[PDB]
């Protein structure tokens, strides 16, 4: 039923294995029992496999597993028992394991880990995914005892009803802690015991409306948390402030993230309470992706947050219906260096107001990829107020053309005009450019004087002729693949004296002898430089290897 | 025997000479001509239409056309005419003297003999009611009157009263606050159009303009009203709307609007209207601090059948507060998202809805918006960024939908798992469809299917056999794999059902029409 590879890596092909084969070949190191009709697992069906370390039992329907069956594997590492029906675990299986690294028991009917200190002799694991979004409702100290160090710890406690104190204060260090929890009842008490032990905390599926913060007696012990992520969380204007008070308990916090959350409010937040006012702390990066706001069209100007804007250096607010970043707010974000407003509702008139005089004074990178911009000239003129702007990504915006001349920030170095629907390129493109991307357009030719351009991406266009190399002396990278290029001037690549990479594949290279002698010969010694492999229009035979009489 | 000579945009400084005597239409528009001599055109005995607009003629002797007895259309608009010498002319049907430099109305007593005059274009910086008397007996179809930039001093309110037209278009001065008292309510006008209107002073906001609009209530003949190039405050804009609402107009059009200020006037009275259709195009607004809902509420509760709003930055639209009479809505080219009209049960009479060129993304949500639109028959969500997540399950489309346009989006073949039952017209061109699943056969009513410009390489054998209602299909601009043991069915079907195929599906690489491939 298997199709093992030449290294002992057996694949569970025909998914219908009623159980584990009779005494498998011991020279096996890996297996594949993903999605197979299984229900029983004993020691007399995988006995002669002490050299097996890769066990994957993903979704089989395993009801019962006879004990003493993991000793027959001895040194097992990647141990997977994902989405099965093992509703009653036992420290017996976590006894034979000597060299374990990945233990996943997510998706099983069990609702507890037993009051018999589970996970013990497997004192070598770094990743442990325990829990199920169905019935797991208890976590006692009698869990996570035989492990003090691990990289990633994921606990699917969706319906967590009770958390025994200090059931997590045991583990000393956890680089990434992922927690699934619908209600916020036991959130503060799970926090107090992990705050000094975790580096990157992640909360999922929690309804934080009505979440209230109360000064927890966790002590003046500094938090180890530097990154706090909230995923698919529900928050209101008031609770968001409460969350802020909690974040101020992590003075070392540097990065805040919100993925696919819902804000049931209009942004009428309070920046202070009656006791402690929210402190910006050391948070330097804020990442918000797909934030659902029912009344987005009614959102406030955020002036209630001006006191938390002076220090942040990187901001991402993606696909969240942003139609305006108020001028006053943009003027307060005095340290902002990187701003990504991709997939929003930005148009020229409002980008002008967002980027008013003195707005985002330190900004060097602005990303407006999938918005609603239509005029290159006006988009460029609008950014002139950002004196230190050097990187602009306005790809996936429907500019259809560009005038002969345009105004752009003085120090423009990177301009992304990919999937922009342009038919030609003109002097509008700034001369100071170092990296230009005009891929995925309708370009027929390219003849721009860009003296210091190091990278040109112009793939997926309709270029008959190669881009003028005599105007791109410093050209290091050149992606010209997928372009309808048939011939090419002789000695043209002698111009690019520093060329390092080049894409030429997917072009109708006419390999007739009285023409390709140069190109077909250039691709020889210049092998490391070529990316992929150009072919002949009349034969799949590569052009790099064909010389003429 | 229509002979045409077009020498427009040729940079001509003189009327081109030596032209065919067959010439019936001469177009020398957009040049640098400054004079028109009898000798320039006396040989063109068959000249019926002469276009010399956008030139620099300062004086024109009308006797210069005495040898062009066939002339019926003369366009001298956009020149520098300050004087016209009157002499009996031909019986023109169209005379355009608009956009010139005349001080007084250029009406010759001779024009009174132009019994077939349908269109009359004029210009003035000064207008006297009497100067129109010469053409008062003429039943003119349309009159266009451009008021010079210095129009205003010593103004006569009754200036327009003697005009006898069905349609009238007044072009007021540009770059000047509206302080005119000229009464635009003319006895015979059914279709009125007014252009350049500016009143950006909140204090005494458009009192002058609103006053002339008020006088339109007394004109029962007024059926259509068009306003162009408006620059005003949000309050005044809403007042203009309110005032027109109580007139006898059936068709109201507004285009090119610049708005500023804060909207305070929210109390709109929709009673006593005769409006059948309202369209608003190209609106730009300054940033503001009042809730956007103030704007949306006003428009969402309008008691009219036809409503169009295009070329604005509107990011949302609310559901009407009560069962709405909206029948056809065109909201193309704005910034609307998936939640437009969400949680609605009041668009039960809506038959047509256009949402082309907005910011739509999730098809499931769009289908739900549709659930309570029990009368919806046509829906256009083309030119957006719509994709469908099959993990969302079955869509909730109303069963009344008959025509669905989803072209120019990013849909895949999963789209066939989310389609209205009785669908007749389905346009899916320019998407990311890589195959046509078996689910398509369930579309028993499908008459027109357009899957051009996608990524189809082949279709399952017999795929179209159960589409008995099919009459038109687009399959072109797809990378069809014409290797024989695979393209057999399609090539045969495309050959026998030749009348149904729109355009011509062709083979990838080969370039030959699929219809012409023969397999063994």
């Amino acid at each position: 039923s298997l199709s093992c590879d030449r290294n002992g890596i057996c694949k569970g092909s025909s998914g219908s294995l009623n159980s584990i084969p009779s005494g498998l070949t011991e020279a096996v190191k890996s297996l594949d029992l993903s999605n197979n009709r299984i229900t029983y697992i004993s020691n007399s069906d995988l006995q002669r496999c002490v050299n097996l370390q890769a066990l994957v039992l993903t979704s089989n329907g395993i009801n019962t597993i006879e004990e003493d069956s993991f000793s027959s594997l001895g040194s097992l590492e990647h141990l997977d028992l994902s989405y099965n029906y093992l509703s009653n675990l036992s420290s017996s299986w976590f006894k034979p394991l000597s060299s374990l690294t990945f233990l996943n028991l997510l998706g099983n009917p069990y609702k507890t880990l037993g009051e018999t200190s589970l996970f013990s002799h497997l004192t070598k694991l770094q990743i442990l995914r325990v829990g199920n979004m169905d019935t797991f409702t208890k976590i006692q100290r009698k869990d996570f005892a035989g492990l003090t160090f691990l990289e990633e710890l994921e606990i699917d406690a969706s319906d967590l009803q009770s958390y025994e104190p200090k059931s997590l204060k045991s583990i000393q260090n956890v680089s990434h802690l992922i927690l699934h929890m619908k209600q916020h009842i036991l959130l503060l008490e799970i926090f107090v015991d992990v705050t000094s032990s975790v580096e990157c905390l992640e909360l999922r599926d929690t309804d934080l409306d009505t979440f209230h913060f109360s000064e927890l007696s966790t002590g003046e012990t500094n938090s180890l948390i530097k990154k706090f992520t909230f995923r698919n969380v529900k928050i209101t204007d008031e609770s968001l402030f409460q969350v802020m008070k909690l974040l101020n308990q992590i003075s070392g916090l540097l990065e805040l993230e919100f993925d696919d959350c819902t804000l049931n409010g209009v942004g009428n937040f309070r920046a202070s309470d009656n006791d402690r006012v929210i402190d910006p702390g050391k948070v330097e990066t804020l990442t918000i992706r797909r934030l659902h706001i029912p009344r987005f069209y009614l959102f406030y100007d955020l002036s209630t947050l001006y006191s938390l804007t002076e220090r942040v250096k990187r901001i991402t607010v993606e696909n969240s219906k942003v139609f305006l970043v108020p001028c006053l707010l943009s003027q307060h974000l005095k340290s902002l260096e990187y701003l990504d407003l991709s997939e929003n509702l930005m148009v020229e008139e409002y980008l002008k107001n967002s980027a008013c005089e003195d707005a985002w004074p330190s900004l060097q990178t602005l990303i407006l990829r999938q918005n609603h911009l239509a005029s290159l000239e006006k988009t460029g003129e609008t950014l002139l107020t950002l004196k230190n702007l050097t990187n602009i990504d306005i790809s996936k915006n429907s500019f259809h053309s560009m005038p002969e001349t345009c105004q752009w920030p003085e120090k423009m170095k990177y301009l992304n005009l990919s999937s922009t629907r342009i038919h030609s390129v003109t002097g509008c493109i700034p001369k100071t450019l170092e990296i230009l991307d005009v891929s995925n357009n309708n370009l027929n030719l390219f003849s721009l004087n860009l003296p210091q351009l190091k990278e040109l991406y112009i793939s997926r266009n309709k270029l008959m002729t190669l881009p003028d190399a005599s105007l791109l002396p410093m050209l290091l990278v050149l992606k010209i693949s997928r372009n309808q290029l048939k011939s090419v001037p002789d000695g043209i690549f002698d111009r690019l004296t520093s060329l390092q990479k080049i894409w030429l594949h997917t072009n109708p290279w006419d390999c007739s002898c009285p023409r390709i002698d140069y190109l077909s010969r250039w691709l020889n010694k210049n092998s490391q430089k070529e990316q992929g492999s150009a072919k002949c229009s009349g034969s799949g035979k590569p052009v790099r290897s064909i010389i003429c009489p | 025997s229509e002979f045409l000579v077009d020498r427009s945009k040729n940079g001509l400084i003189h009327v081109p000479k030596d032209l065919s005597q067959k010439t019936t239409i001469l177009n020398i528009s957009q040049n640098y001509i400054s004079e028109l001599w009898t000798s320039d055109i006396l040989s063109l005995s068959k000249l019926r239409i002469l276009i010399i607009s956008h030139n620099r003629i300062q004086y024109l002797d009308i006797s210069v056309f005495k040898f062009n007895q066939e002339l019926e259309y003369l366009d001298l608009s956009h020149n520098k005419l300050v004087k016209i010498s009157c002499h009996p002319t031909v019986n023109l049907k169209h005379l355009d003297l608009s956009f010139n430099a005349f001080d007084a109305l250029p009406i010759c007593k001779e024009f009174g003999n132009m019994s077939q005059l349908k269109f009359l274009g004029l210009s003035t910086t000064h207008l006297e009611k009497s100067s129109v008397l010469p053409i008062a007996h003429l039943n003119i179809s349309k009159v266009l009157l451009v008021l010079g930039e210095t129009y205003g001093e010593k103004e006569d309110p009754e200036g327009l009263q003697d005009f006898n037209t069905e349609s009238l278009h007044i072009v007021f001065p540009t770059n000047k606050e509206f302080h005119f008292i000229l009464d635009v309510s003319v006895k015979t006008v059914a279709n009125l159009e007014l252009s350049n209107i500016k009143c950006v002073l909140e204090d005494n906001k458009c009192s002058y303009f609103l006053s002339i609009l008020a006088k339109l209530q007394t004109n029962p003949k007024l059926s259509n009203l068009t306003l162009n190039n408006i620059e005003t405050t949000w309050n005044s804009f809403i007042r203009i709307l309110q005032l027109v609402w109580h007139t006898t107009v059936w068709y109201f059009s507004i285009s090119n609007v610049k708005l500023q200020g804060q909207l305070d006037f929210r109390d709109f009275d929709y009673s006593g209207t005769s409006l059948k259709a309202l369209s608003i195009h190209q609106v730009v607004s300054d940033v503001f601090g009042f809730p956007q809902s103030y704007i949306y509420e006003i428009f969402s509760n309008m008691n009219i059948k036809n409503f169009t709003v295009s070329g604005t930055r509107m990011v949302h639209m609310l559901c009407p507060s009560k069962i709405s009479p909206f029948l056809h809505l065109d909201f193309s080219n704005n910034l609307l998202t998936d939640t437009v009209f969400e949680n609605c049960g009041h668009l039960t009479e809506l038959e047509t809805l256009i949402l082309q060129m907005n910011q739509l993304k999730e098809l499931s949500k769009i289908a739900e918006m549709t659930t309570q639109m029990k009368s919806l028959q046509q829906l256009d969500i083309s030119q957006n960024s719509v994709s469908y997540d099959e993990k969302k399950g079955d869509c909730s489309w109303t069963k009344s939908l008959l025509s669905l346009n989803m072209s120019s989006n990013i849909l895949t073949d999963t789209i066939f798992r989310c389609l209205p039952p009785r669908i007749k017209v389905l346009d899916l061109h320019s998407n990311k469809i890589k195959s046509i699943p078996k689910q398509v056969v369930k579309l028993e009513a499908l008459q027109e299917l357009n899957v051009a410009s996608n990524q189809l390489k082949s279709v399952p054998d017999g795929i179209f056999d159960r589409l008995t209602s099919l009459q038109k299909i687009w399959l072109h601009t797809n990378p069809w794999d014409c290797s024989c043991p695979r393209i057999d069915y399609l090539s045969r079907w495309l050959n026998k059902n030749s009348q149904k195929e729109q355009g011509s599906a062709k083979c990838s690489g080969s370039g030959k029409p699929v219809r012409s491939i023969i397999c063994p």
Binding site: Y300, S303, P326 | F290
Partner: peptide
């Protein structure tokens, strides 16, 4: 861009 009313 609603302005806080107070």
């Amino acid at each position: 861009x609603s302005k806080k009313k107070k």
